[PDB]
Amino acid sequence: EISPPPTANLDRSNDKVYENVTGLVKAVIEMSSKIQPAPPEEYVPMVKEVGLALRTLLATVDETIPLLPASTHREIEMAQKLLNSDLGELINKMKLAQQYVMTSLQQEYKKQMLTAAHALAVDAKNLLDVIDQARLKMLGQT
Amino acid sequence: EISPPPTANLDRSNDKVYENVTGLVKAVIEMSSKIQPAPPEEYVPMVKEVGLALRTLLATVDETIPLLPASTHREIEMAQKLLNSDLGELINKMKLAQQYVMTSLQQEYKKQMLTAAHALAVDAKNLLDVIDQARLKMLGQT
Ligand SMILES: [Cl-]
Numbered sequence: 001e002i003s004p005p006p007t008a009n010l011d012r013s014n015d016k017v018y019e020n021v022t023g024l025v026k027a028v029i030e031m032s033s034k035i036q037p038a039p040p041e042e043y044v045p046m047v048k049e050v051g052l053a054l055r056t057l058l059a060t061v062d063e064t065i066p067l068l069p070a071s072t073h074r075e076i077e078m079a080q081k082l083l084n085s086d087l088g089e090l091i092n093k094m095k096l097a098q099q100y101v102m103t104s105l106q107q108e109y110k111k112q113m114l115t116a117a118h119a120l121a122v123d124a125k126n127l128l129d130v131i132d133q134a135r136l137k138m139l140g141q142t
Numbered sequence: 143e144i145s146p147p148p149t150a151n152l153d154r155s156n157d158k159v160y161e162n163v164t165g166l167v168k169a170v171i172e173m174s175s176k177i178q179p180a181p182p183e184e185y186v187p188m189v190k191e192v193g194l195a196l197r198t199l200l201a202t203v204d205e206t207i208p209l210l211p212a213s214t215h216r217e218i219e220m221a222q223k224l225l226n227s228d229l230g231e232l233i234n235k236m237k238l239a240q241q242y243v244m245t246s247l248q249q250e251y252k253k254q255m256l257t258a259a260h261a262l263a264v265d266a267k268n269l270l271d272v273i274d275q276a277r278l279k280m281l282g283q284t
């Protein structure tokens with residue numbers, strides 16, 4: 001049920017009860033979000049968090065490419081494109097999942113959306129590894 | 143697919159790429175845990191996080207009760223018992239949800255498990271408020 005925000009007449013800087021209530025409410029909220037299948041309308045905002053994380057990573061990689069050997073650029077740049085490829089797929093299977101909300105396809109497109117997301121994480125790790133090999137190659141310094 | 147942990151020959155203290163890959167992988171993992179319905183076997187560990195959070199809160203409240211007016215104790219102590227009541231319910235509907243994994247009751251007991259968890263969060267907030275009224279009453283100091 002609904003209640004007003006906690007009283008403003010008490011200092012919370014060292015309020016352990018308040019911190020612990022907070023902790024417990026978050027653990028419950030987190031537990032229910034995992035146990036329950038998120039409503040198709042939550043897809044968009046979840047996908048937005050993943051997109052922001054991706055461009056923050058792509059911007060950073062662009063700031064790193066210049067500082068690396070010319071011979072590593074092509075492979076790195078290709079790794080980046082595979083990621084945008086995974087994002088397009090993700091975004092598109094999301095919209096499809098949302099399209100057929102109450103049909104025999106909702107679950108299948110949802111699965112394909114999850115597979116796209118999974119690929120995006122696998123390919124991010126492979127990018128890190130391609131970047132590390134480039135960095136280590138650069139250290140070819142005596 | 144499976145790959146070795148990232149190279150140990152590079153310092154990560156200021157590695158923004160590594161931090162960003164990490165961020166993106168977490169956002170993906172978090173997204174999939176929300177979109178997907180967690181397997182009944184994940185219930186236990188999730189419920190353990192909620193239980194630890196509860197006793198940490200109950201221990202803290204026990205350390206606070208003594209410092210409050212004798213007239214507020216009974217109501218506070220009752221608030222605590224309502225929480226252990228919610229935990230028993232939660233634990234029991236979990237086990238039931240796990241019992242009837244592949245029957246016509248799995249989903250219903252799962253729902254009852256979620257209702258218990260929800261009550262636990264609502265009652266934690268009410269406890270905070272009962273504790274705040276006690277604190278403010280204590281300040282009856284001139
Ligand atoms: Cl507050």
Ligand SMILES: [Cl-]
Pocket residue numbers: 147148149150154
């Ligand atoms: Cl590492």
